[PDB]
Scaffold this motif. Structure first.
Motif, PDB file in Angstrom:
ATOM      1  N   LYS A 297      41.633  22.801  42.888  1.00  0.00           N
ATOM      2  CA  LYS A 297      42.786  22.766  42.003  1.00  0.00           C
ATOM      3  C   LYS A 297      43.756  21.726  42.449  1.00  0.00           C
ATOM      4  O   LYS A 297      44.391  21.859  43.503  1.00  0.00           O
ATOM      5  CB  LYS A 297      43.452  24.178  41.932  1.00  0.00           C
ATOM      6  CG  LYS A 297      42.495  25.213  41.338  1.00  0.00           C
ATOM      7  CD  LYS A 297      42.707  26.690  41.819  1.00  0.00           C
ATOM      8  CE  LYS A 297      43.886  27.333  41.186  1.00  0.00           C
ATOM      9  NZ  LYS A 297      43.946  28.810  41.553  1.00  0.00           N
ATOM     10  N   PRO A 326      44.277  20.806  47.968  1.00  0.00           N
ATOM     11  CA  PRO A 326      43.838  21.498  46.752  1.00  0.00           C
ATOM     12  C   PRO A 326      43.100  22.802  47.093  1.00  0.00           C
ATOM     13  O   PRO A 326      42.434  22.872  48.092  1.00  0.00           O
ATOM     14  CB  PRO A 326      42.935  20.450  46.062  1.00  0.00           C
ATOM     15  CG  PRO A 326      43.351  19.137  46.682  1.00  0.00           C
ATOM     16  CD  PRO A 326      43.762  19.427  48.047  1.00  0.00           C
ATOM     17  N   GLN A 327      43.284  23.851  46.287  1.00  0.00           N
ATOM     18  CA  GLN A 327      42.660  25.141  46.526  1.00  0.00           C
ATOM     19  C   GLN A 327      41.324  25.221  45.808  1.00  0.00           C
ATOM     20  O   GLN A 327      41.228  24.908  44.617  1.00  0.00           O
ATOM     21  CB  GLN A 327      43.541  26.291  45.996  1.00  0.00           C
ATOM     22  CG  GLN A 327      44.791  26.494  46.813  1.00  0.00           C
ATOM     23  CD  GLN A 327      44.585  27.496  47.930  1.00  0.00           C
ATOM     24  OE1 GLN A 327      43.453  28.011  48.137  1.00  0.00           O
ATOM     25  NE2 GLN A 327      45.646  27.697  48.750  1.00  0.00           N
ATOM     26  N   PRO A 328      40.291  25.649  46.523  1.00  0.00           N
ATOM     27  CA  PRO A 328      38.979  25.821  45.872  1.00  0.00           C
ATOM     28  C   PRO A 328      38.887  27.048  44.924  1.00  0.00           C
ATOM     29  O   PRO A 328      39.545  28.105  45.120  1.00  0.00           O
ATOM     30  CB  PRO A 328      38.045  25.948  47.066  1.00  0.00           C
ATOM     31  CG  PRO A 328      38.911  26.774  48.106  1.00  0.00           C
ATOM     32  CD  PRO A 328      40.330  26.234  47.882  1.00  0.00           C
ATOM     33  N   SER A 375      37.607  33.236  43.850  1.00  0.00           N
ATOM     34  CA  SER A 375      38.811  32.574  44.321  1.00  0.00           C
ATOM     35  C   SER A 375      39.367  33.201  45.596  1.00  0.00           C
ATOM     36  O   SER A 375      39.827  34.358  45.574  1.00  0.00           O
ATOM     37  CB  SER A 375      39.896  32.688  43.214  1.00  0.00           C
ATOM     38  OG  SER A 375      40.979  31.782  43.448  1.00  0.00           O
ATOM     39  N   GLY A 376      39.380  32.445  46.688  1.00  0.00           N
ATOM     40  CA  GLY A 376      39.947  32.932  47.940  1.00  0.00           C
ATOM     41  C   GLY A 376      40.845  31.897  48.563  1.00  0.00           C
ATOM     42  O   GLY A 376      40.550  30.704  48.473  1.00  0.00           O
ATOM     43  N   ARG A 378      42.190  29.178  50.475  1.00  0.00           N
ATOM     44  CA  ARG A 378      41.545  28.168  51.362  1.00  0.00           C
ATOM     45  C   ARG A 378      40.132  28.571  51.822  1.00  0.00           C
ATOM     46  O   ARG A 378      39.653  28.088  52.874  1.00  0.00           O
ATOM     47  CB  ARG A 378      42.457  27.800  52.553  1.00  0.00           C
ATOM     48  CG  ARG A 378      43.866  27.375  52.026  1.00  0.00           C
ATOM     49  CD  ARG A 378      44.940  27.148  53.069  1.00  0.00           C
ATOM     50  NE  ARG A 378      46.134  26.700  52.347  1.00  0.00           N
ATOM     51  CZ  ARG A 378      47.015  27.516  51.769  1.00  0.00           C
ATOM     52  NH1 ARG A 378      46.906  28.827  51.911  1.00  0.00           N
ATOM     53  NH2 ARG A 378      48.053  27.003  51.113  1.00  0.00           N
TER      54      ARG A 378
ATOM     55  N   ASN B 346      49.779  19.712  46.721  1.00  0.00           N
ATOM     56  CA  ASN B 346      50.039  21.132  46.491  1.00  0.00           C
ATOM     57  C   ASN B 346      51.161  21.630  47.409  1.00  0.00           C
ATOM     58  O   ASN B 346      51.041  21.574  48.603  1.00  0.00           O
ATOM     59  CB  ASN B 346      48.736  21.921  46.732  1.00  0.00           C
ATOM     60  CG  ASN B 346      48.916  23.407  46.667  1.00  0.00           C
ATOM     61  OD1 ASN B 346      49.837  23.936  46.015  1.00  0.00           O
ATOM     62  ND2 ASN B 346      48.005  24.111  47.304  1.00  0.00           N
ATOM     63  N   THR B 353      47.517  33.205  48.818  1.00  0.00           N
ATOM     64  CA  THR B 353      47.334  32.964  47.389  1.00  0.00           C
ATOM     65  C   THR B 353      46.444  31.768  47.142  1.00  0.00           C
ATOM     66  O   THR B 353      46.336  30.891  47.990  1.00  0.00           O
ATOM     67  CB  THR B 353      48.708  32.773  46.651  1.00  0.00           C
ATOM     68  OG1 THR B 353      48.477  32.660  45.255  1.00  0.00           O
ATOM     69  CG2 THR B 353      49.439  31.526  47.072  1.00  0.00           C
ATOM     70  N   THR B 354      45.842  31.697  45.955  1.00  0.00           N
ATOM     71  CA  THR B 354      45.207  30.465  45.505  1.00  0.00           C
ATOM     72  C   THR B 354      45.963  29.809  44.358  1.00  0.00           C
ATOM     73  O   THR B 354      45.473  28.844  43.758  1.00  0.00           O
ATOM     74  CB  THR B 354      43.767  30.728  45.008  1.00  0.00           C
ATOM     75  OG1 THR B 354      43.837  31.632  43.924  1.00  0.00           O
ATOM     76  CG2 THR B 354      42.845  31.322  46.160  1.00  0.00           C
ATOM     77  N   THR B 356      48.672  27.273  42.897  1.00  0.00           N
ATOM     78  CA  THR B 356      49.066  25.918  43.307  1.00  0.00           C
ATOM     79  C   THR B 356      50.260  25.362  42.518  1.00  0.00           C
ATOM     80  O   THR B 356      50.564  25.769  41.395  1.00  0.00           O
ATOM     81  CB  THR B 356      47.864  24.870  43.165  1.00  0.00           C
ATOM     82  OG1 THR B 356      47.438  24.876  41.793  1.00  0.00           O
ATOM     83  CG2 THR B 356      46.684  25.218  44.043  1.00  0.00           C
ATOM     84  N   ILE B 358      51.746  21.384  41.992  1.00  0.00           N
ATOM     85  CA  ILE B 358      51.628  19.992  42.381  1.00  0.00           C
ATOM     86  C   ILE B 358      52.809  19.213  41.922  1.00  0.00           C
ATOM     87  O   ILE B 358      53.117  19.166  40.733  1.00  0.00           O
ATOM     88  CB  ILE B 358      50.370  19.338  41.870  1.00  0.00           C
ATOM     89  CG1 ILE B 358      49.152  20.141  42.324  1.00  0.00           C
ATOM     90  CG2 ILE B 358      50.278  17.883  42.395  1.00  0.00           C
ATOM     91  CD1 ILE B 358      48.263  20.447  41.094  1.00  0.00           C
ATOM     92  N   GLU B 368      49.102  25.950  38.759  1.00  0.00           N
ATOM     93  CA  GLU B 368      47.880  26.705  38.410  1.00  0.00           C
ATOM     94  C   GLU B 368      47.984  28.117  38.921  1.00  0.00           C
ATOM     95  O   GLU B 368      48.490  28.348  40.015  1.00  0.00           O
ATOM     96  CB  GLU B 368      46.647  26.075  39.012  1.00  0.00           C
ATOM     97  CG  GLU B 368      46.408  24.665  38.522  1.00  0.00           C
ATOM     98  CD  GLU B 368      45.600  24.633  37.252  1.00  0.00           C
ATOM     99  OE1 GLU B 368      44.874  25.623  36.955  1.00  0.00           O
ATOM    100  OE2 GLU B 368      45.716  23.638  36.522  1.00  0.00           O
TER     101      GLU B 368
END
Ligand SMILES: [Fe+2]
Ligand SMILES: [Fe+2]
Lengths: 498, 497
Positions: A297, A326-328, A375-376, A378, B346, B353-354, B356, B358, B368
């Motif tokens: 992301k 960016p987060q996977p 979704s986790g 990192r 980010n 959390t995931t 984001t 930017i 996001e």
């Protein structure tokens, strides 16, 4: 909660090793299934400096070809450096001669990324115009092939799709104004002339920027369609990394072409920004394409986080360095093939089993939102593999992956893409590689088989590495084949049935 | 797999009932908690036509006020129509006199949405300038109150926030240029002077479009901040005729400093969705955690809520929802500190959390979400939490009504940290929004019950009941059954005594 790696065992993934003169017998614990016969071939960097001159980036070290052979419950291990121009000239001049992705010293032919079959031959590859024929039995290097001799591309990904008949499809950018060309290499014919001499461009995808192609690592394929995802990672003493930049406003554009009619389809699919390296699978469901992807992301290039100086830091610093990355996220996108103007302003995704959406706008763009499958924080599900021979391009249920913890590989994962259920294998101070699926030869089910992974396990008393064998049903351990030497990081490979 | 409703019992949610002259005794099964003492008050439509003249939309039927009273393990039920101008004039003229949200017959005061406290008083509301004072004990109508007499807003939402001291915050659009004003109503003082008389505008949020305010249904509040989510649903005959979708704006998010009464000029942006209900909002290090019930896309979800369509047989109901926006619970994370050295990256550095955010070169901050819950055409909606103790604060649990192609058919609990869920459902039973009541000796966030009103039409069944579930696991604790139908209710409260 969070798994920690204070001992720093992962640094062994990025440490130079010596090749072997001949295969070595691994020590087997548990029982290797007697139906498992063939070779796991994998590629990775194996030499991370030339004398006192360092390579800087994960994708710079010299290609090393690895083989685990399985026969009657017995296992051997062999590895040889690939004799590319990069490696040979470095050995001859005793310095870094050829510029690599992230190290400035002639386009690199350092085939450290993957290996794949063409006709009766096998080719190790990176992402340039040069691939390297190799002998899958002996690991000797045979020759260098320049794709530019045969077709109009500047490079080609390390993730070609192989159809059941052996037909090979790939994608590369080209001077079609910049465009992207799909290349097809035919199966071996009765004459037995080189299928590469019979390569052709099937279809061309347009580029979002006249002079800047996006970075393309992989693409999707179904029986009837080709899917290409055009991300905001653009290509503009320099190395390859210096050329990359992020486009902040385009988001991601998705493209489809009719495979059999060899035609681009002018459907303007659009969504928010992400990086993408690996498609998981792609298939057709009524008049929709289901596109399963490993996303990151944001628009910053994830490769900026993969310099060796950073991957070799101590654990608290590795975590710190990934804080703004960016987060996977694994995402399912759904692309309608039929666009009816009467539905302008509405969600076109009428499938019963998804929360993915696709909104038809007045300017004819089709705005997509994903169904999130995994979704986790990192914690990436990455290096995805499926039962490719029987379910690639088709309706499927299971994916296998390598779990990355702030970019350090530390577990193996299985995902049911229908229910989002997961399974995990992990052991403290053990760093596995991409898992490869091998079906039981007589399986009728999708996940009736094993997965193979190469595991690095440094520590007092411990064997330094081992090939791990898991049951594909539940990721329970079936066996391991231990060796007495280190094995560095490997990216991709295959299992050649014998 | 898919739960089906071929029998079509949900139709009773949208069928006229008569009010009661006095409370009925409900038949108890299980055990009503002995510590539960007070009144569950809820609002919904209860009259869906005036003679031969139909109301068309789910939000048009005349407001009916419902009460379940709990004392020492027994339960009564009572309901009365709210004597708004809309209802009274309809009764006097034997026709539809006042234009409703979706029915053309002079702003409606049909207070069918919610009830909340202001000082010592209670007010039923809709989304206009008119709120109706009502007696919580007898269900009698006391007074119409015009908010325009006191503050400059065109209307106000049916989801005010209420601080522990009784301070009421609400939001409504105004003629700033269009803008949105935050109204604050103080607690009752020693004078006992009507707190509404002391209403004031706290702060003003700017509008994305000079002449078109977005539709606003609810908003977020923490100890230090106010959060407003400006969606692509725009207000440009009946009320529904004035709505349009803005295709290119997506969603703009806005924060204001509550204590300093200042708009913060941070341009948070994301992709298009409808939003009706904030779940909860809180502060975590330098970030605002914003939990939302979203609907993915820009088409106005209310287009799917006409009574003619909600009263169809089940295969048709499902067909009608095929192209609807998809519901999804989302967590957005908003950085309060923006450092330009981080441009392109980010900013959400939080460990858990995931989500984001930017930072772009033009200073927009692209968000996001972390997805917390997502099921095909299966919404977690009408969210409720342990609000007295956790509203505006770090929390773990949310309760909701599950909608199956817009038909309410289950109750849900969500752990927002782990994404674990729990569900309560029974065939041919259609519940309402669940309201949480704490156990008096609570040590944990979910020590308590939820109360929901359930419709269960059928051969040899009580037509409706109050359901009490244990908040820990949504296991059933008790029911209080009645022998009459109860139509859909939207929102309400529990008033302890
Ligand atoms: Fe790859
Ligand atoms: Fe509401």
């Amino acid at each position: 909660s969070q798994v920690e790696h204070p001992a720093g065992g992962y640094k062994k993934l990025f440490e130079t090793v010596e090749e072997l003169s001949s295969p070595l017998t691994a020590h087997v614990t548990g029982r290797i299934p007697l139906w498992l016969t063939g070779s796991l071939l994998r590629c990775g960097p194996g030499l991370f400096e030339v004398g006192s001159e360092p390579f800087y980036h994960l994708f710079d070290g010299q290609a090393l070809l690895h083989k685990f052979d399985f026969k009657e419950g017995h296992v051997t291990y062999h590895r040889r450096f690939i004799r590319t121009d990069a490696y040979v000239r470095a050995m001859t001049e005793k310095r870094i001669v050829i510029t690599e992705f992230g190290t400035c010293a002639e386009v690199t032919d350092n085939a450290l990324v993957n290996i794949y079959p063409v006709g009766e031959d096998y080719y190790a590859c990176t992402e340039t115009n040069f691939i390297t024929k190799v002998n899958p039995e002996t690991l000797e290097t045979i020759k260098q092939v320049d794709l530019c001799n045969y077709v109009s591309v500047n490079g080609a990904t390390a993730h070609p799709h192989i159809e059941n008949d052996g037909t090979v499809y790939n994608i590369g950018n080209c001077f079609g104004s910049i465009a992207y060309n799909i290349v097809k290499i035919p199966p071996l014919q009765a004459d037995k002339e080189d299928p590469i001499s019979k390569s052709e461009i099937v279809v061309q995808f347009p580029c979002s920027d006249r002079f800047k192609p996006s970075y393309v690592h992989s693409f999707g394929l179904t029986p009837n369609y080709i899917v290409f995802v055009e991300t905001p990672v653009k290509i503009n003493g320099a190395n390859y990394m210096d050329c990359f930049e992020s486009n902040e406003t385009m988001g991601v554009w998705l493209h489809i072409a009719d495979k059999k009619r060899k035609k681009y389809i002018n459907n303007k699919y659009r969504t928010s920004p992400f990086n993408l390296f690996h498609h998981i699978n792609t298939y057709e469901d009524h008049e929709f394409l289901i596109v399963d992807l490993c996303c990151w992301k944001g628009f910053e290039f994830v490769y900026n986080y993969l310099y060796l100086a950073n991957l070799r830091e101590n654990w608290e610093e590795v975590k710190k360095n990934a804080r703004k990355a960016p987060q996977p996220e694994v995402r399912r996108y759904v692309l309608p093939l039929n666009i009816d103007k009467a539905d302008t302003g509405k969600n076109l995704v009428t499938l019963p089993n998804t929360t993915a959406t696709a909104i038809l706008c007045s300017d004819e763009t089709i705005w997509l939102e994903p169904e999130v499958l995994f979704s986790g924080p990192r914690q990436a599900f990455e290096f995805p593999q499926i039962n490719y021979q029987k379910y690639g391009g088709k309706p499927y249920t299971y994916a296998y992956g390598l779990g990355l913890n702030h970019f350090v590989p530390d577990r193996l994962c299985k995902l049911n893409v229908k229910t989002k259920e997961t399974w995990v294998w992990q052991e403290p101070d053990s760093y596995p590689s991409e898992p490869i699926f091998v079906s039981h030869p007589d399986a009728l089910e999708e996940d009736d088989g094993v997965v193979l992974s190469v595991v690095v396990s440094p520590g007092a008393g411990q064997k330094p590495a081992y090939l791990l064998i898991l049951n594909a049903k539940d990721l329970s351990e079936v066996a391991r084949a231990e060796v007495e030497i280190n094995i560095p990081v490997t990216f991709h490979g295959l299992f050649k049935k014998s």
